Design a protein around this ligand. Structure first.
Ligand code: CU
Length: 275
């Protein structure tokens, strides 16, 4: 039996779809706060167990009979303690690429969870996921509308991959043997700068798009005047700065080796913008 916490997101959806290619639906259990609002998961035919993530006891019950748990990102403290109480034997966690040394502020919370796992006594594997190509492409439309893509990543190299790629990796780790106790640094086979992104954008769109590098404050002070919340804006700005320092770069090709095929290139992802 495989359980998935935090499976109501886009990544979780993909992981479940991937798993279903080799694991019977009933052997997959999605733990959610409200099975009613989780119509998607239920639609997949998987086992759904309700549990409030602020309720360790509820989580423990929801994890009964679970041998392997995929924890998709405190809340994690309750989940890990519950997994310990229920007898979970293996936990795979979606962390952040090179979390212990990462310049990105997003690493903080992940490190806290990685520490919890290390102290849990439960065998675990860290799926240290790099950036989603979708993270930057979410801003491609605006960049195309104004002919400029803004950021604060400088010449930092972003070894992005798709949620689908990361999801396949998670599914592989939680379902097949030989992936326990590992620390996998997962990223795209190739890497690109925001300058190259703009160029790829211009190439396939026919429209001119230039990258404009801003400073963290200006970039953030640019997102806080378009709608996006302050916290969200601050993170995005912090991330680009982390990227400018190589925080989103990795060339181990661990991801492609793990999934058995090349990671999805930026070019392919960009193509989806003009389908
Ligand atoms: Cu495609």
């Amino acid at each position: 039996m495989i359980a998935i916490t935090g499976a109501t997101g886009q990544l979780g959806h993909y992981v479940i779809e991937s798993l279903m290619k080799t694991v019977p639906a009933s052997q997959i259990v999605a733990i959610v706060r409200n099975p009613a609002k989780a119509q998607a998961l239920a639609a997949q035919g998987i086992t759904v167990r309700q549990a409030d993530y602020g309720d360790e006891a509820a989580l423990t019950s929801a994890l009964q009979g679970v041998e392997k748990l995929l924890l998709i990102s405190p809340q994690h403290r309750n989940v890990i303690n519950a997994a310990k109480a229920a007898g979970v034997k293996f936990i795979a966690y979606t962390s952040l690429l090179h979390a212990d040394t990462s310049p990105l502020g997003l690493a903080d919370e992940h490190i806290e969870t990685e520490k919890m796992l290390a102290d849990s006594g439960i065998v675990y594997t860290l799926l240290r996921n790099g950036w989603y190509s979708e993270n930057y492409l979410a801003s491609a439309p605006a960049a195309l509308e104004h002919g400029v893509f803004i950021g604060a990543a400088g010449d930092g190299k972003i070894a992005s991959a798709t949620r689908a790629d990361y999801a396949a990796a998670a599914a592989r780790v939680i379902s097949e043997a030989g992936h326990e106790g590992k620390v996998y640094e997962l990223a795209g086979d190739s890497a690109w700068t925001l300058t190259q992104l703009a160029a790829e954008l211009t190439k396939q769109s026919g429209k001119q798009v230039t990258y404009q590098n801003l400073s963290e404050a200006d970039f953030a002070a640019a997102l806080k005047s378009v709608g996006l919340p302050d916290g969200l804006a601050d993170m995005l700005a912090d991330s680009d700065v982390g990227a400018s320092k190589g925080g989103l770069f990795d060339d181990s090709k661990t991801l492609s080796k793990l999934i058995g095929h090349p990671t999805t290139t930026l070019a392919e992802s960009v193509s989806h913008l003009f389908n």
